[PDB]
Amino acid sequence: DLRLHLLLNTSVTCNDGSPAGYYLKESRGSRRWLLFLEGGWYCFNRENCDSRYDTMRRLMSSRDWPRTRTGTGILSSQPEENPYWWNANMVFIPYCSSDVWSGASSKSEKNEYAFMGALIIQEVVRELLGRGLSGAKVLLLAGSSAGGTGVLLNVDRVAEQLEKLGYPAIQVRGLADSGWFLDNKQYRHTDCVDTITCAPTEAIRRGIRYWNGVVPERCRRQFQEGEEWNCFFGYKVYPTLRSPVFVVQWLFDEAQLTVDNVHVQEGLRLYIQNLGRELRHTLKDVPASFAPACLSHEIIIRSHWTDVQVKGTSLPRALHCWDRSLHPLKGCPVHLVDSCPWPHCNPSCPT
Ligand SMILES: *[C@@H]1O[C@H](CO)[C@@H](O)[C@H](O)[C@H]1NC(C)=O
Ligand SMILES: O=C(O)CSc1ncccc1[N+](=O)[O-]
């Protein structure tokens, strides 16, 4: 079990102004720290944030959070379930800012909701430093879905924060799971007239303004004012990052298909095959990646995350090989992208 700590800086809040927080399980003597960002979409205007507040309130508020959570998958402390980092210090950071971890805005007379995802991460890091993180050798910022995009948006800021605080020896790395999206053509098209019809590029453009969203500095400098939404797309932001980042992405991610309006005749067959080919292409020059040809969503905190393999190598093995590479390796690969073109052409895909 990981134990809840609400942030001592109560100005760093979830959407409704309740304190943000983190769940922690320390591992005495380990100098590895895993900070995991939860996912769960986002909201981008008053109306759709209000709807999310009614039926997804745990993603907008800490008022009903339980005192503990069980660590699963990469957050498990059992080597049977987590061959990779079972002995690490484990941190689960709940997603309660609805801003893809990008926001830097407080609730105020002008703002019904606070969007503080970028500041939540910084505050968690700050408060963990007094709880043992100061002695760390590696801080792996991991995340799934919107949390995986959050890794891409925040990993270099965590590195800069620790450098400025006087901890240049902590190696900051990122693990982005299911957060590598394409701003591709939808299978069927609708103009952005409401929440359902609004494609992510336009929803994110609106969200950035609504959240006071922030993106990594080098990416911001490339795309400039009004175009920061580009930095939410992994293939565009990744080349601007300095921290080592391992990318986990199903070739046929269910969230990608959702925003593409895909729910099989020749037109759709070709669409799906082209999606997989495009995703594969974006990963060609990503040296640490794991991209199985499956229709699914998230992997790293699932209890059976050890089951899927690409070219005979599981994700926990690939992550271990990545660790070794950061000290090519014989029989210990880190770039694992399926080449077969249809979901479940890999027999190890989740059932
Ligand atoms: C609390 O968090 C806010 C927002 O990130 C920050 O500006 C402020 O300096 C923090 N205060 C303390 C005492 O850490
Ligand atoms: O959290 C989830 O399940 C999905 S998040 C997502 N999905 C698709 C496109 C963009 C995003 N966003 O977060 O940048």
Tokens (6 digits) for 79: 């080597």
Is 99 catalytic? The answer is no
Residue 4: phi and psi, rounded to 5, are: -70, 135
- Burial tier of 88 (Cβ tally within 10 Å: 0-12, 13-18, 19+): buried
Helix axes 117-129, 146-164, angle to 10 degrees: 50
| Size (the chain), residues | 351
CA 315 to chain centre: 16
Q: Give the residue numbers spanning the domain of 61.
A: 1-351
Q: 35 - beta bridge partners? A: 91, 141
Give, using CA atoms, the residue closest to atom 9 of ligand 1. 9
One-letter identity of residue 289: S
Which residues does 343 contact at the CB level (< 8 Å), separation at least 6?
251, 252, 272, 276, 293, 294, 295, 349
CA atoms of 160 and 67, how far apart (whole Å): 31
Alpha helix positions (H), the chain: 46-55, 117-129, 146-164, 200-211, 217-223, 234-237, 254-259, 266-283, 315-325
Cβ-proximal residues to 339 (8 Å cutoff; 6+ apart), any chain: 280, 293
Which residues neighbour 164 within 8 Å (Cβ) at sequence distance 6 or greater?
A: none
Cα–Cα distance measured from residue 60 to residue 189, given in angstroms and rounded to the nearest whole number = 30
Active-site residue (options: 98, 145, 178, 289): 145
Measured in whole angstroms, the distance separating CA 58 from the mean position of its chain's CA atoms is 18
Q: How many structural domains comprise the chain?
A: 1
Q: Which residues line ligand 1 (CB under 6 A)?
A: 9, 11-12, 119, 123
**Rg of the chain over CA atoms, in angstroms?**
19
CA 106 – ligand 1 centroid, Å: 12
* Whether residue 147 has its Cβ less than 6 Å from ligand 2: no
Two tokens, residue 132? 């043992």
Helical (H) or strand (E) element with 144: strand 138-144
DSSP 122: H
- Which residue owns the Cα nearest ligand 1 atom 5? 119
Burial of 228: CB neighbours in 10 Å, binned 0-12, 13-18, 19+: buried
Task: Give the distance (Å) from ligand 2 centre to CA of residue 297.
Answer: 10
Q: 167 CA to middle of ligand 1, Å? A: 19
DSSP assignments along 327-350, one per residue: ---TT--SEEE----STT-STTS-
